[PDB]
Enzyme design. Structure first.
Site, PDB file in Angstrom:
ATOM      1  N   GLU A 137      -9.675 -13.880  12.484  1.00  0.00           N
ATOM      2  CA  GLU A 137      -9.118 -13.551  13.746  1.00  0.00           C
ATOM      3  C   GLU A 137      -9.926 -12.799  14.764  1.00  0.00           C
ATOM      4  O   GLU A 137      -9.592 -11.730  14.829  1.00  0.00           O
ATOM      5  CB  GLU A 137      -7.706 -12.925  13.413  1.00  0.00           C
ATOM      6  CG  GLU A 137      -7.057 -13.697  12.482  1.00  0.00           C
ATOM      7  CD  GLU A 137      -5.363 -13.315  12.603  1.00  0.00           C
ATOM      8  OE1 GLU A 137      -5.293 -12.034  13.479  1.00  0.00           O
ATOM      9  OE2 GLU A 137      -4.446 -13.930  12.195  1.00  0.00           O
ATOM     10  N   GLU A 253      -3.319 -19.269   7.762  1.00  0.00           N
ATOM     11  CA  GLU A 253      -2.058 -18.361   7.610  1.00  0.00           C
ATOM     12  C   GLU A 253      -1.077 -18.985   8.265  1.00  0.00           C
ATOM     13  O   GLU A 253      -0.979 -19.765   9.614  1.00  0.00           O
ATOM     14  CB  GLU A 253      -2.437 -16.806   8.383  1.00  0.00           C
ATOM     15  CG  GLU A 253      -3.666 -16.115   7.883  1.00  0.00           C
ATOM     16  CD  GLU A 253      -3.872 -14.816   8.466  1.00  0.00           C
ATOM     17  OE1 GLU A 253      -3.009 -14.613   9.387  1.00  0.00           O
ATOM     18  OE2 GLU A 253      -4.540 -14.185   8.480  1.00  0.00           O
TER      19      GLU A 253
END
Length: 313
Positions: A137, A253
């Site tokens: 991320e 995710e």
């Protein structure tokens, strides 16, 4: 039946699970989770193909150049990987939660390069079932642009010792689905691109005390035609870009937080799996135990039908 290698390796991820809140904590266990060997057997017996392992390398390195990793810690990661492969799970290791890199990428980017020089080196002779993932991320000051500058430098270093190992490349801006068009790819045949899905965010992160402002609870997700189309609209966008850029997708995710009501989670989770599948994305549920958990450590039992929602069997 000449198929793209990246794409065949992406299929091996299949339906995976994240090993969350453990090695990406400052110190493993300091958040409530400590990886036990048995975890991987348990994950394999339930039907998962792969495990994704968040690791905060940046909390376990030397203050001075070239930022050598504490041997105990590297031994610990090596243990955990051995145990996952012993259980026939494909295994993704990343760099996760590098706070300084988010704030000052120009300064700390070279620390990530170094970190990966050492990780690629230690893992160089591991079976191809172990995939690397440069960083989780990118966000804040590690902009789409800096990420496009940084990640290839790290890639270059990994490729010296691991010429074909799958490297997973995260989408910037928290890996949000809509930032896919901002990722600049490289001419490498063994890369996978990854996004994370948590829309609608006010649903999946209701009650999360760590969000500011913290969001209200009691927000439903009901599987309505208009709700399913939001997600299908999001994924189709990711799919159209992956197809034009000749790259496979890993939804690294997805999960809804335990303060959302269970029915909505079961519904939301099932739908994302289903749509992730229809577009031929591999996937990995966030996370194994803890606040978004599928597995109840007290009872030693999977939470159902949520786990079926996430896995599809």
């Amino acid at each position: 039946v000449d198929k793209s290698s990246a794409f065949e390796y992406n299929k091996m991820i299949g339906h995976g699970i994240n090993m969350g809140n453990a090695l990406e904590a400052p110190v493993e266990g300091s958040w409530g989770v400590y990886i036990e060997d048995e975890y991987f057997k348990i994950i394999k017996e339930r039907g998962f193909d792969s495990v994704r392992i968040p690791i905060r390398w940046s909390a376990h390195i030397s203050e001075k150049y070239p930022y050598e990793i504490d041997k105990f810690f590297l031994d610990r990661v090596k243990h955990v990987v051995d145990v996952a492969l012993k259980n026939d799970l494909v295994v993704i290791i990343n760099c996760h939660h590098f706070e300084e890199l988010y704030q000052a990428p120009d300064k700390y980017g070279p620390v990530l390069v170094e970190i990966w020089k050492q990780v690629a080196q230690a893992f160089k002779d591991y079976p191809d079932k172990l995939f690397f993932e440069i960083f989780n991320e990118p966000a804040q000051n590690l902009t789409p642009t800096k990420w496009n500058e940084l990640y290839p430098k790290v890639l270059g270093e990994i490729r010296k010792t691991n010429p074909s190992r799958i490297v997973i490349i995260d989408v910037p801006n928290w890996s949000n689905y809509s930032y896919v068009r901002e990722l600049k790819l490289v001419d490498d045949k063994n890369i996978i691109v990854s996004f994370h899905y948590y829309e609608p965010f006010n649903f999946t992160h209701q009650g999360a005390e760590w969000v500011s402002p913290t969001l209200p609870i009691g927000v439903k997700w009901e599987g309505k035609d208009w709700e399913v189309e939001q997600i299908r609209n999001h994924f189709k966008y990711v799919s159209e870009w992956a197809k034009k850029n000749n790259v496979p997708i890993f939804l690294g995710e997805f999960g809804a937080y335990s303060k959302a009501d269970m029915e909505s989670r079961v519904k939301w989770t099932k739908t994302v799996r289903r749509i992730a599948e229809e577009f031929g994305f591999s996937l990995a549920y966030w996370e194994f135990c803890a606040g978004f958990g599928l597995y109840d450590r007290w009872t030693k039992t999977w939470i159902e039908p949520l786990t079926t929602s996430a896995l599809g069997k």
